[PDB]
Amino acid sequence: ANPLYQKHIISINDLSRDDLNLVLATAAKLKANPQPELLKHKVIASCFFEASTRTRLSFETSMHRLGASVVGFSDSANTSLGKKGETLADTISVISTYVDAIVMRHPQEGAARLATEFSGNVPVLNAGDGSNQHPTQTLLDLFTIQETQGRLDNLHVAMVGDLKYGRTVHSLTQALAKFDGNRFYFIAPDALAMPQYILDMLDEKGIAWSLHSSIEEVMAEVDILYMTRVQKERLDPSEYANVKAQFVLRASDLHNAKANMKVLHPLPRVDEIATDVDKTPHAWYFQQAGNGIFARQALLALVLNRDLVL
Amino acid sequence: ANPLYQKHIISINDLSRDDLNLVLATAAKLKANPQPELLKHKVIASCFFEASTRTRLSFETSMHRLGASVVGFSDSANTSLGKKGETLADTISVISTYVDAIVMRHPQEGAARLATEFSGNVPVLNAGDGSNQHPTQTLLDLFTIQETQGRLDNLHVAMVGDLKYGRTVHSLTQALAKFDGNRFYFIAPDALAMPQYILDMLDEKGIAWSLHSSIEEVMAEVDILYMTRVQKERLDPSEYANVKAQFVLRASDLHNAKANMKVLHPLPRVDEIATDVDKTPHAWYFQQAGNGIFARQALLALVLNRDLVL
Amino acid sequence: ANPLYQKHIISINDLSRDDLNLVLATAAKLKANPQPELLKHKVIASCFFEASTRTRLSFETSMHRLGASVVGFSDSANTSLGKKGETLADTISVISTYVDAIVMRHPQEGAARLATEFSGNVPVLNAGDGSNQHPTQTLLDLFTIQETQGRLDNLHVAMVGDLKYGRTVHSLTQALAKFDGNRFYFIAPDALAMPQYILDMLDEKGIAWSLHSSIEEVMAEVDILYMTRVQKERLDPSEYANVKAQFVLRASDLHNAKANMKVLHPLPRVDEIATDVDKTPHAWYFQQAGNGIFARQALLALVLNRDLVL
Amino acid sequence: ANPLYQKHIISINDLSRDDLNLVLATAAKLKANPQPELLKHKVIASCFFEASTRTRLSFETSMHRLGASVVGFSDSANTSLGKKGETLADTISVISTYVDAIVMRHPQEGAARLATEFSGNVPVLNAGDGSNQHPTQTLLDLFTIQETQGRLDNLHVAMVGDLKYGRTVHSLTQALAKFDGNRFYFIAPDALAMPQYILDMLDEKGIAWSLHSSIEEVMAEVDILYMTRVQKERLDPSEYANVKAQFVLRASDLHNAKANMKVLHPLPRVDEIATDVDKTPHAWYFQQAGNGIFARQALLALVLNRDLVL
Amino acid sequence: MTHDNKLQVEAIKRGTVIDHIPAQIGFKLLSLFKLTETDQRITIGLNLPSGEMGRKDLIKIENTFLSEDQVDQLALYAPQATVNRIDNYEVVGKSRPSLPERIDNVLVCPNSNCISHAEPVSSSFAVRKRANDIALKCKYCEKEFSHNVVLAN
Numbered sequence A, B, C, D: 001a002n003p004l005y006q007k008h009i010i011s012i013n014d015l016s017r018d019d020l021n022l023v024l025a026t027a028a029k030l031k032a033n034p035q036p037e038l039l040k041h042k043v044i045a046s047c048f049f050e051a052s053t054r055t056r057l058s059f060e061t062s063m064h065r066l067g068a069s070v071v072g073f074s075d076s077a078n079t080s081l082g083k084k085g086e087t088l089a090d091t092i093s094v095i096s097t098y099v100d101a102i103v104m105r106h107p108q109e110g111a112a113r114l115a116t117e118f119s120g121n122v123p124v125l126n127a128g129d130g131s132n133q134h135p136t137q138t139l140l141d142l143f144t145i146q147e148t149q150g151r152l153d154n155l156h157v158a159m160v161g162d163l164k165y166g167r168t169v170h171s172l173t174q175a176l177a178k179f180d181g182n183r184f185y186f187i188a189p190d191a192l193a194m195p196q197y198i199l200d201m202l203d204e205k206g207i208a209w210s211l212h213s214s215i216e217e218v219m220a221e222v223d224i225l226y227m228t229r230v231q232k233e234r235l236d237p238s239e240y241a242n243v244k245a246q247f248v249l250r251a252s253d254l255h256n257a258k259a260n261m262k263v264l265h266p267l268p269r270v271d272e273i274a275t276d277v278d279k280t281p282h283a284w285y286f287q288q289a290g291n292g293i294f295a296r297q298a299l300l301a302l303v304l305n306r307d308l309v310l
Numbered sequence E: 001m002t003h004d005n006k007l008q009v010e011a012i013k014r015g016t017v018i019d020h021i022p023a024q025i026g027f028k029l030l031s032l033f034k035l036t037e038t039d040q041r042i043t044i045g046l047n048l049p050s051g052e053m054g055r056k057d058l059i060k061i062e063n064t065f066l067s068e069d070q071v072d073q074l075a076l077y078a079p080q081a082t083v084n085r086i087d088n089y090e091v092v093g094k095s096r097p098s099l100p101e102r103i104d105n106v107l108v109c110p111n112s113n114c115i116s117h118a119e120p121v122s123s124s125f126a127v128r129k130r131a132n133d134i135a136l137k138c139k140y141c142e143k144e145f146s147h148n149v150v151l152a153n
Ligand SMILES: N[C@@H](CN(O)N=O)C(=O)O
Pocket: A050, A051, A052, A053, A054, A055, A056, A268
């Protein structure tokens, strides 16, 4: 069957360029020609140990669009899981006897990988494990960039905001570094700069990257403007204000932007992108969000259905 | 139609040996040959007034595996039910006009029976009502024993742990006492011994049973080792420790066990069975849990579909 | 000067017969002639790590009646409590530098003794530590019996209720066993009987004791009827009610009681003593509670003031 | 009469060199000869809008040791608090009519200064206002250094930990910079380094300072080792641990320390000072905390009593 | 019978022997690798004379051999320690602990939020040698630290 058949989808790093291409290819296909009965008699577990509505609704919607059945929860004190000392291991050993696939979201970093060792034959798709991995988020980002730019190589990518803790941009930076000729522009306050280990990686692959203090500094060159969330709880309230400065995007900043540029954002944007931007042709965060359905549908189709789509 | 058609499934005691046989027969059948469209245009209410994730996920998974639609909740302050003085009666009178069947779990002992009096024609399946009844749990246990032992009569059954409050073992003991030639071995601390009313029943049916202080005392004879949960909140913290002694199972204890013995556990086992047991061929609690799907599927099929399975 | 000056009051068992007499004698003296300025310039810490309003107010009132000042907290989840980080040791090492004495209530057994190793010449009085000790409760009990019966020897003591978990009765039994010729009557449901270690102690000293199922079996010879609280959670609802029988007290039961008998209770009597008992001359639980001020004023006086009072 | 009589104590920066000396001199005098009735008929409000048990008990004990009475609340979500309606202004305008002095802790920066504009000739003492000021904490720190080192000038001060957010070290640095010839050593992870505005101040006054990565780089010349608390939340778990290195203190590290060195800490030392340090003669954090009574007794004495003490 | 003595202080036979273990590292290996869970005989010597100027530990455990992906596991603790197979010197290559690609069951992830801590799984770290340092990447949380971090905590 297809290369991802019955494979656990835990980390983006475990995904080869080939894999990414196949997932993105499938995504485009299902988008063009939906297959509502593909996974008809399948039952999928949507296990959100840590709540995350949007990601959960996107994931489950994908399951339904393929015809699969869904059961699950949101352990945010809504269930009766692991009260005293009941392990994640035992939970998986149980649930893995009920369903055909487990989609899980957990607060601890290696949850999905652990699940993998107790789910015998049942595939586990990581919907997010603490500060570590979030495979499908990266896939939907790459898909959006590819669809709006027509390729994933030789692009000018700007990433703004909290580049230090936003593991969303770490995963996306590494994903794009598996393609050639990309140039990166990193805009972030000194206290939240891209980590050195990421720059080390870019250097060793000879990829070009530069630091900048403002978006306007490179607005003219950028193909993709990736806006990130800057959590208040991070810095000091006064610290934030002093830096939020322009790591905030406003319609006015797009005066000299490329006709093809798209502004992306992991989503909760309240404090980073002004609504006046929503009207411009560059705003693509809602479309980006909409693409989560195809990337996640493609992933489920690939691991649960032997042959390729069509 | 079949004897259980449109029948409420509230108490194991209301189930005749014939009934148990029919449920177990159906369970094996659906296990062998799944029927994903059996209950296609049915809508089932999954009403967990009291939360219980595993039991809920098992139950709903069963509904989907048969093709039925599911709606419901977990009243653990997640809903807006009975705020001031809104009765269970009224809740049922309402919900019973929406669905084709009600699966309910409630904190009070006669909830399911009450539901029965206000659900006109709509069948109610008790998923657990306080310290009283839990029909499907017993059915899945019996099914597991039958499948692993090839019969439900003339067996050596050991029950360890909190035999006083574990209503799981009370129901299972009574269920097995409807079959012949079974011998029971009760292992529990004096403060949590099997209740006298249960022993009275065994005596009046002339069934053999004996008390023991340790598992090793009868490990050689046992066909089924039923391990129960010992809740901390029960005894005194120091009390527990002083008795937990060996009412805990470890791989080492299985040196002289019968090749056919299976170790069962209602499930939350963290504090009773050491993980090293998980590797032995005797560990059957996860398989046991997996069987909940077939026993519960069989029950739903029987009450919602006139003719027998196939 | 006095034997208890500057000593830690942690366990009733560290108190010798003479200590008990000294405390009781002091209590009577302060009751007959108050000394409102005895601890005038002292500052005492009332640290209720575990909330206990009644004994807290009793303890604090005692402090004020001797003229001392009070600082403290009922950190019952309403203080910048060590976010499960700061050790009790550190808390005490800090607090012991501010005050002259520390009265503490804690959920864990051993808390007060541990504080003792970190306080600096600053005496610690145990206001209760989990299921271990409650020194002052036994003292007020002993004081109340002595005042009403004129002595603590050659008495007929009945203890009704939860004798298994009611650690106040364990302490009171061991304290009265330090006196000669006492006779005990234990009335409790078999699931909550007096612990064998207590009976062992009594046999070791040749103290006469016996078990009874109802209070009306011994009402005729009892000098002191100590009623214990029975928390339903200690048993299941159906169990509680079943045994509830007569283990509750009501006026009609005192028809043949001795003129000198007093009915005692630690409190929270909601479910054990009917209000129609309050009017009889035997009711003495509110007077008993009122004696807490004297027994605890006495301890504070002894530990913080070198010379005896009156 | 005295310079601080009836003055508001809000920011350590409003305190002149002479003020600091006066407070410290008074603190030493009260420590050598207590005055239990100095504030006899005064009534002071302890208003902890934000719970802070340790500093609250320290403040309240100070009040009682001077004979004053105390009313207040640690409205840590347990008072009929202005349901996010009543302004702090109104709260103060009411409270300032009841008492003679107001000691307040608040979550927002500026709270105490705002109270100052609504209190009526009633002095307000800031017990901490968000991330701004904590006057009395700097005073006890200064007092402890003076007592142990015999002076506040010509000292070698090392500050370890979170220098970016630990506002207690910002204040202590600015206070010690009001004295001559002091030498500073800053040891902190680069992500939590001393703020540049602080270094600017030191350069402006020609004060000698330097950065170091470990305590063992300067252990030899240090007179005062001020240990700061590092809250993991300030960084991510993996980050914290990574830097944790040596920024924690343990006995073995004090092998080459100066006989006169004292190790200080605001507290909550759970994660920075190993307990094997407590026994060395250098450990002085518990004595430091104990000096809070004297420095705060001193402030209350100065602001509420016209004439100097001793 | 061919064995020939009653030596309770220093002997030999069909058994593996680890050589030149730094002081205070010998017992560590006994614990970390549960080398005493054997039924086979074991003779250890600690804080004994070294290369004419120091101190060292010595471990001799009879009737048992070590492998390549095991002796290596001593690399992070006893680097310059030699391992002479002693069925009677049937050793081949200059057996010295090299850095394994993976180190399991002994290390503890410094990351407090790592799923490995409260679960029935074995620790597992990928190894990468650094200049003046050694990087260990957790199989679970995928966080990377220096052995200096992983060995302290
Ligand atoms: N996934 C987010 C919540 N969110 O926005 N969901 O759509 C979180 O858990 O932080």
